[PDB]
């Protein structure tokens, strides 16, 4: 369901308040630790010596409640970034006191406001807190979408509101957030909560808030419309925003007082649940991917490492792929052998990288549908796969299928064949060394034969995500170059991110390649326009393939296959984030380099600013031959 | 006597009526229960001893402020976001609740009434300012001129359409409820610091004073050149004029001292009787030399100023 809480600034008695909040169906309560008006003086005599307890004790709630049900808040009078020195000194002391108390209590989260540009001291105090001692509390920053000064009305005779378009005025809040997090070095303990008013921004700078660590949203009761039956409802634009937020599983907090007291306060939750229960259901892709959002994995390298049975089991659970292969074969056979030669003509097909043989079965089915006679050779190197093939041959396939245990680049086939079928594509199409394997195994193709796939390509696009940036930063190892984590690709289900531009093609291959001196090395330059002031964190790619004349597979978001799910996009990070201004373009260069033992990629950004070459020589990442 | 056994530790407000009786406001700002009370004394020197109170009740929440409405009404600014009205009964024994509305989305920080006797205004930490109808128990209007916590409002003693306000945005406004654009910005001849309190001059309808966060006060002419003087080592947080043909200005501050100034802002009297923040002060109408203060040290102090 949808988690939610209540925001109160007046809690006379915690036992009763907590009870009532729970009664209405809320999961948690946000509240101050210290009475908010109870200013505490430090330094100055006699005020600093004021006697008595400073707040309520912690013996009122069980430990379980403290660390589960309560979110803390900074008192409103604390202002570390004020101009008067005396205020600043008391404010810093006050902030530390409150944070330490919350730590004592074990609170899971605490809220700090941001309402202006200069938050330098706020950041200084918070980071000193973060790095001192040992704590697990999460810090959320409260940032409005629209700065309050632009939400004021125009009722002042000599102080009119701005009535023109100051473009940057729509970006003030984002900037405040951005500066705060860089001061605090993108700590993973710092995240945001957004406060939604009645006035929404254009579709942009909505999108720019994605790829940001949003944990919660704040909805005041003041933005509900009243319907014909007297119940609070949302406008259509607000509903659209909520549906988007539901995908990130943010928590919702309801604030303000009850403007519909006659309908019971809890009715606001009922409305919110109604909308979530009417969101459209997930498809198979989404269900399959549940639990892997923004999770990084190293790519597989089957040429070098033998895969275990479970990997194969997973690869096979995606029937759309096999159906497309079967169609490709079916058409190919029909296009080569006429009906008149049907019973006197036997075609020879070879499967390279047979695995557990799902393609063998697909091949046999295609031949049956096509009513054409075939012979098959299944070739695999992985001995732990060969062993299953032996059983298949014996138990069902019979003599029509020959099983060969060898490296396809070394094996001498006894016969030439006219159709070669393979499944060597990886997530970026050529990162499996598929063209090397196939070029080797080209000499046994008949000169008038065909390769399935015949063609494949690859695509790249710039992306932004601060969350992913940290996930990469986190993947450090001892006795390794400390930066060698930004120089290797990752397989990932990208979810909480923003796409900066359309994808563009990068490297392309085809088979059989009849050119002399083919050269599988590549160089490519790409350039993309940018329509938002955002920060580049890395590039991501996709691929497309042609199995046959009219048969293709794709994972490009725009042409993505209808229910194909075994594949995930590839991520290529850069070491430093790059700020890009609207109207500029991003120019990126890629290389595909090789030698007699290894293959590796190198990449860099040349514009708007230059960056370092990532992974030169394959020092951090290689693909073994 | 139909009152709680114990008064809360912090005293936050005090005001006199023309018959010499006083009203105190109190709250618990620390401890297990966070709520306050209202108390009435007819013997000023007996305060704060509960045993000699004439009346008093507990409230459901803390009390941010409170003022007199005519002779019997008590208008209260609550922490709950509520605006509420209490009334003294015929025997000045019980305090009766008349109404309670919840119109603010945050703590009500200030409340005051206007010279017509039927209108009132309030401010809150929520940036919204509201105008109330005291007879109908409704909100007549609301405005969002400020983009910061409202810190002070005040009604003009001479005009029932007029009030002042300020907030932590360093803007000071003058309001006129009869205009299409009710607010007008005063501006400032000495900008740069946030104002903390406002008060109207008792005789001159176009004159008012304010204090700031640095302990400085200033006297200004609404139509335009200002007069100022530093007084306190800390934020002023409170100003009131004496009931004299030649008024004197009392000034409170967070430095816990009390001062009385001349019209020239010269210091005439100073006291350090308090041991904690001082929250308010009021003049006794029956004794022009007597100033009474209230604060967080739980003392009630009677000062005689050598006027
Ligand atoms: N020649 C072919 C044929 C089919 C393919 C299907 C997809 C892809 C892209 N995916 C990867 O590279 C990749 C990385 C890490 C992975 C997996 C997959 C899986 C697991 N892990 C975590 C570590 O073991 C855990 C167990 C289940 C699967 C490449 C293909 N290449
Ligand atoms: C369909 S999973 C990919 C298959 O390619 C096979 N493969 C990769 N490289 C070779 C090779 N050089 N010779 C034979 N099979 C290979 C792997 O063993 C795996 O079964």
Numbering used by the authors:
A (entry chain A): 13 to 637
B (entry chain B): 21 to 244, 247 to 329
Reproduce passages from the article.
PRMT5, an oncogenic target for various cancer types, has many inhibitors manifesting little cooperativity with MTA, a co-factor analog accumulated in MTAP−/− cells. MEP50, a 7-WD40 β-propeller protein, binds PRMT5 via contacts with the TIM barrel, making a hetero-octameric PRMT5:MEP50 complex one of an apparent D2 symmetry. The octamer methylates a broad spectrum of substrates, including COPR5, SWI/SNF47, pICln48, Riok149, Menin50, etc., and making targeted PRMT5 inhibition a potential cancer therapy.
Cryo-EM structures of 11-2 F / MTA-bound human PRMT5/MEP50 complex and its apo form resolved at 3.1 and 3.2 Å respectively show that 11-2 F in the catalytic pocket shifts the cofactor-binding pocket away by ~2.0 Å, contributing to positive cooperativity. The PRMT5:MEP50/MTA/11-2F complex was prepared by mixing stock solutions of MTA and 11-2F with 0.4 mg/ml PRMT5:MEP50 (~0.09 µM) on ice for 30 min before being applied to glow-discharged QuantiFoil grids. The nitrogen atom of the 2-amine group on the quinoline ring and its nitrogen at position 1 form strong H-bonds with catalytic residues Glu 444 & Glu 435 with N-O distances of 2.41 Å and 2.86 Å, respectively. The aromatic ring of quinoline is stacked in parallel to sidechains of Phe 327 and Trp579.
